[PDB]
Design a protein around this ligand. Structure first.
Ligand code: ADP
Ligand code: ADP
Ligand code: ADP
Ligand code: ADP
Ligand code: ADP
Ligand code: CRN
Ligand code: CRN
Ligand code: CRN
Ligand code: CRN
Ligand code: CRN
Ligand code: MG
Ligand code: MG
Ligand code: MG
Ligand code: MG
Ligand code: MG
Lengths: 368, 368, 368, 368, 368
């Protein structure tokens, strides 16, 4: 009957009195009550958006957004809660007013070569979603298989240096997968509670895979945390070559994908849409590992790092710590700046860090 | 259940990598995704609109639109795809901004007499659709029979020189139909793939017919490719008389049709609505055949023809080629210009063509 | 408004006064009125079922059903019209009461070797539809591509003698396709009016292909007239080996298809569901070509052939005639009998025909 | 099914080629097609509005509107057709633009006494509808009974000179009803085709009645052609007393009706809503009979009458003619002018008419 | 539009080619296709039912069902898949035909005392669900809080020896929770993949708690894996006292719950409804730990255990192994047998096990 009463929204309000994530900070009873009825056309709802944040109050060793998007419409349907979170996460970028600009030019990134005694590794990463298909948090098996087929068919057209092969996770022996993971190429099974709570580990390892070139300098993860994750890696400090290869490969992949009538998720307000609001905009993360004996001498590291808008993850894996200090240092903000700008910022920050080692003298300049 | 997922629009996107029609040129994944859910009140959909273009990439010896309209609402519902196609097809006429004006006056078409040694035939054609009834691509049997009844009842009222008789295709012996076709009067069965793919050959020959006057100088095809096709023909170069008869007969037919409460499809933005976007506006085609020994001497013909906005089809039938060169030359653009203007343009172009007989001198002037 | 009146069903009733197909014979105003509102869950309707029959009254040189099915549900939704047609087409088999049994055993088909001087070719064909996907008359582009992907992935698992390769029609040069067609391997473009009117030529050649083994003795047409057409052919009279290979290959293909969670359309009442009601049940056609000088001496062929329940097509296919008499003789009925029974019947009929070479004496026995 | 086609609106368009009513004049195929889907909340439709006009092309001896309203919403829902009709019927009043003002003051109508030798009868009539109840063309039995109950209960409260009694038509002997009709008090059974075609004779004589005061100078017809018709009569030429009594009685009746929570249909754009668009606005008709020997001498009567905006009906009954000339002369326009203005206009026109007795002189002044 | 096509069910079919759980064994494409549209009134669907089984193919050291129920209606809506699974899991009990009988009598369980040198612990467990509230896999925050409130209010009425207190998990320090877990009283956080994949760890630790008596011999877990889990423990081999206390406490709890108008989920076909089909029927598990030096001598243990219908989990925790062999031995089947019968079976099995200590002789009797 229509006379039956629903549970009032405040009855469903999560208990976030001990949470320490941006979703908990920016969620209020008014917002929850306002948004608890809405839903994206594919059925995504607010509770599904904030489940990962609700279940995970902590997760060292970095601050977490606590939200995910089930599809493109989410960021528009639940903008009343995503917008403040995005603004806080990206040092003040305002999606409501500002616009995002993307440029991928390896010409305007001159220099960008690091000392081989302090870097010994350079990687550039980005993510891409296929329009019309639900994101990993909400995708069904059919949608995941469709994403895999589209990506594999597109990548089959890559020729020349970028030519490579696709390896299905379900067809790889555990030893091979472990060897690939230990080499920083493949992705590990999603056991971290943040991924599991978001629902981005359903049906594992179905429809997940890795497409890599023969030199393994150009890789593409299929269906791990986004529809596609494009990676360009090199064991050294030559960020210039890595970024040039990344740019050309990404352009070719986009062209091949569009050839078949598929287009990436994108809007000028937010840039490239991805699951985690922390990856919006360019979704780009350019970083380098650090030599063990050197940066270990730092004492006021976090202040300097927040000074330069850089983030320091441990060795391979965000969930891992740093032992025998070798830190993966990358840019912190991915929205509001162009890819070239982000790479230049990373290069400048790393040059500062290696210059700030000061193994002969003492003194931290910070230099806000 | 509502949790089941539909095929993403890009999955249905046609493969037009080898097509050479305006629909293929102006169709993009964004447009297809935007329009793949809409539908006219009678159920016409985008796929039905573009089926003929998808199936037919070629079709010599002229460029083809590759689209058809199922009803009046189509041009409004799918305007996002029809408008660029119409603009390209009609040398820049912009339906969004401009307006179309129609005038049928035989007084302001002074002159217009061709040399009898180079024309020997003059025809004028137009199309008309009855409002409220689906177009041939989408019409059911009941709608087709209704169109036939309305047209026949209206035409029964014609008196005087225009007085004529209606002949039902289903009641005509094959020999009589073949004789009429060979005389350029009747229409042949629609075997060309463009007509069949559009669905404009369903239930043949049911409800199709030809109404012609005793002299056979005035004819009306019922349910061939439009609801009505009004034709005025004469074996000679006297375009003036042909056009005068065409104008008066068309006015009388329109009056008789409106007498019973039926009105033609029409809107000032597009003019007279017809199935093929190439026939919008006036839908008028005025043309003449050409004497065999004469125009055969031409070498740079296509450049001159595109110069004058004229189209050259072979002998009887667009699908046929030209042998022993005798070309059917007509106007190319039917929207944005009035009927009088189009006829005057055809007369000027034909006078230019005959003036360039070059049986005693050489040189092509083009004269853009 | 709800006060508006629909066209009465009799207004839409087709004009079949001159038709000569089973649909025209068994269609009555009462049946049409009863069924003109129903529709299968995918939207198939009666008019779409009978369009091919309505448009085509003739089509030599064989009697035609005049109907097609858009999906599995059709045969159940429109049973009131399909059942009499099926019963008449399959010499009295009653789908309402009887049941169909299928057995594919090459052991119980002993003998089956024809004289090499009168056969010189032996082929066995069947069709199969993937459950859950619309049939070629109604399938959209996405469904056709899904069928192609499922079939190709399944067939990739065939090993040993059956090992083969898939060739996409869109990627084959016209010369190669013509050579394959002339060799009786590949299928030609569907230009015959029966196929076009049924809508089984939309989006050609998208998603159509041929998968064949290295010896080309085992072929599979993908998306030509059914979802799959499995063919086993040999240039000779050894029907035994051909049928054995056909049986084992079909079993392997079915196993591979089921491995991935796809099941063939099938119900014990009708057997294997296919587009044309003439292919229901087993859908099997076993046949042989005939030597030119020999059977040409016959005069009362049609009576004998109808006596033996055999069909006589042209050497080039159903749509071609027989010149320099070389007739493709096959079984006529495919529903109500098992595959082994049909093959044995074909063998017995061919042995009877060759026994009646009438080179020594004369006289036709008929032998009903 | 949704694929079935409705009859196109032009198929339902009435055949008005021989009609002579305002509805026929102002009805066009475009208007009919536009309005043939709409309907008032109570279910009234355009065909029901125009049925009376369609069935009746003639009806001497006056020009007829040819339309009726089923409820209050009609004039708003079908304004596209009622507005031109109202404008033509009320000599230019434009309901879209201008507003209507009502005043009932017997003080500002000084004079207004006619010669007893040329009038011998004075009547004033008006109509009123109860809001929330369907009009007589569309009212069901329950609604008609509700109207009767509301009106009778209200009128029971009248006191003093206006005190009277209610007589139910179903409880009155035929002789009494005939006597009342012959005295110009009661209304006759609705046998005229205009009333019957409009559906305003259904369930006769159920729920119809007459409430009159003891002197029979104040009367109220219940459910004859409107919900209420208030009438004030006097056998003489004293229009002043008749009109003041009419005003006070109408005010008292309105007060009593509003006492119980019922309000009259009214909007400033149109005034008081009634069934026939010819009665909109005030709905007031003030008139007088004429002595037999006197006005019979007129020859150019119609021109003069149209000059003064007066209408001449025969003796008792609009449907009746004038024998032994005694004409009922009243105002022609009821909308756009106030009641006092209309009464003054009638008085001036009657004074003009009697002044033109022409028993001793000659001249048709007309005096536009 | 309604012309868009859904993904065929076989496209969503899980890839279970390597799974080893009952759901994978008893899931077929036909069943999946049949059930993929249905849904319980609260929105539970088949994919949600089988997600835990799909994600987890293994999970030593016991065979897993691989399914869960979202609410009471699930077992009825998806019976076509639950029934075979239940039958296989409960050694042939047929829910379709048979009925379940429950009796909780401590009188008819005479004896039941184990040797203190081989048991040193005795526990009895059961589960209960509140009717009208979604099960832990599907319950929202409001429903979980409602379950907690109902259970706590009911348990507040327990008096006498059963008198106890409720401890909210969110209000207990980590040290206290760890101490309780190490003592085998409290439940640990659900980190095992089977619980997480089923969605039974959402919003942890909100609304989860433990209500225990002062002696801690009677405990009730609130919202861990069922709505309520009632447990009775004793550090010894006196199963008689444990079971009688369990019976009386359960009866009192049920009475108190029903006092407020709440009733347990129950139907005679299945008994007491719970999330995991392995806990249906009584949901009872009676077990004992085993002394370290003793049962370690066994070699053919699994055959004997399957002989006696007993299951051997490791030490505290099903997910944990057995080191220094001390096995938790309990009954294996909970549906089709009464609680008294199950406890007697457990007692007989444990007596057999201890009798087969073989510390003096050798030989395994099995004794099927
Ligand atoms: N600079 C680098 N050099 C080598 N490997 C890297 C680098 N940065 C990241 N990786 C590899 O990427 C994998 C996942 O790292 P993660 O923190 O998830 O980066 P992302 O943000 O791109 O997911 C790790 O296994 C790690 O080895
Ligand atoms: N100038 C002409 N003289 C004689 N016949 C003509 C002429 N133009 C067209 N026709 C006749 O019209 C028929 C169809 O021509 P088509 O190219 O379809 O013209 P339309 O554009 O009006 O369809 C042909 O059979 C042809 O004989
Ligand atoms: N027994 C046979 N031997 C050789 N070729 C054959 C045989 N049967 C069919 N074909 C070839 O297959 C092609 C299509 O045959 P068709 O008449 O469509 O058979 P079906 O009815 O099974 O489709 C033709 O080109 C024909 O040459
Ligand atoms: N001036 C008048 N004097 C007497 N009776 C009248 C007068 N005007 C109208 N009536 C009476 O009203 C009755 C109906 O007349 P009708 O033309 O319908 O007027 P209305 O416009 O009020 O309907 C007739 O029977 C007639 O006798
Ligand atoms: N016989 C027993 N004696 C002592 N503790 C037990 C016994 N059985 C179970 N437990 C305790 O119950 C907790 C959970 O046990 P579990 O294996 O989940 O039982 P269930 O299969 O009923 O969930 C463990 O921490 C364990 O210490
Ligand atoms: C660890 N996280 C959370 C974040 O991005 O803040 C991922 N989105 N992977
Ligand atoms: C041949 N065509 C295509 C076109 O007009 O371009 C017809 N519409 N008939
Ligand atoms: C030629 N036909 C018609 C028939 O089978 O009768 C095909 N279905 N191919
Ligand atoms: C006679 N008529 C028609 C009209 O008013 O024009 C009535 N409405 N009574
Ligand atoms: C470990 N399991 C699976 C099972 O019961 O089989 C739980 N339901 N807890
Ligand atoms: Mg990462
Ligand atoms: Mg043409
Ligand atoms: Mg064939
Ligand atoms: Mg009247
Ligand atoms: Mg447990």
């Amino acid at each position: 009957s229509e006379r039956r009463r629903l549970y009032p929204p405040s009855a469903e309000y999560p208990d976030l009195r001990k949470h320490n994530n941006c979703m908990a900070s920016h969620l209020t009873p008014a917002v929850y009550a306002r948004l608890c009825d809405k839903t994206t056309p594919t059925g995504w709802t607010l509770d599904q958006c904030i489940q990962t944040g609700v279940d995970n109050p902590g997760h060292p060793f970095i601050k977490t957004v606590g939200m995910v998007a089930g599809d493109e419409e989410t960021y528009e349907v639940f903008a009343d809660l995503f917008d403040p979170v995005i603004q806080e996460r990206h040092n003040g970028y305002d999606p409501r007013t500002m616009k995002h600009t993307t440029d991928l030019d390896a010409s305007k990134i001159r220099s960008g070569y690091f000392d081989e005694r302090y870097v010994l590794s350079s990687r550039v990463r980005t993510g891409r979603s296929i329009r019309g298909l639900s994101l990993p948090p909400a995708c069904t098996r059919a949608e995941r298989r469709e994403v895999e087929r589209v990506v594999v068919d597109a990548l089959s057209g890559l020729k020349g240096d970028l030519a490579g092969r696709y390896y299905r996770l379900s067809e790889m022996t555990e030893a091979e997968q472990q060897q690939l993971i230990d080499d920083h190429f493949l992705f590990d099974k999603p056991v971290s509670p943040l991924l599991t709570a978001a629902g981005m580990a359903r049906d594992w390892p179905d429809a997940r895979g890795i497409w890599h070139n023969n030199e393994k300098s150009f890789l593409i993860w299929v269906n791990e945390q986004d529809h596609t994750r494009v990676i360009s890696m090199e064991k050294g400090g030559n960020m210039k070559r890595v970024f040039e290869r990344f740019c050309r490969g990404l352009k070719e992949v986009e062209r091949l994908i569009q050839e078949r009538g598929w287009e990436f998720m994108w809007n000028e307000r937010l840039g490239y849409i991805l699951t985690c609001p922390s990856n919006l905009g360019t979704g780009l993360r350019a970083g380098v590992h650090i030599k063990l004996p050197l940066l270990s001498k730092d004492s006021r590291f976090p202040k300097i790092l927040e000074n330069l808008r850089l983030q320091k993850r441990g060795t391979g894996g965000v969930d891992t710590a740093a032992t025998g200090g070798v830190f993966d240092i990358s840019n912190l903000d991915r929205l509001g700046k162009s890819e070239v700008e982000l790479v230049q910022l990373v290069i400048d920050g790393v040059n500062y860090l290696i210059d700030c080692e000061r193994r002969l003298e003492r003194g931290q300049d910070i230099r806000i």
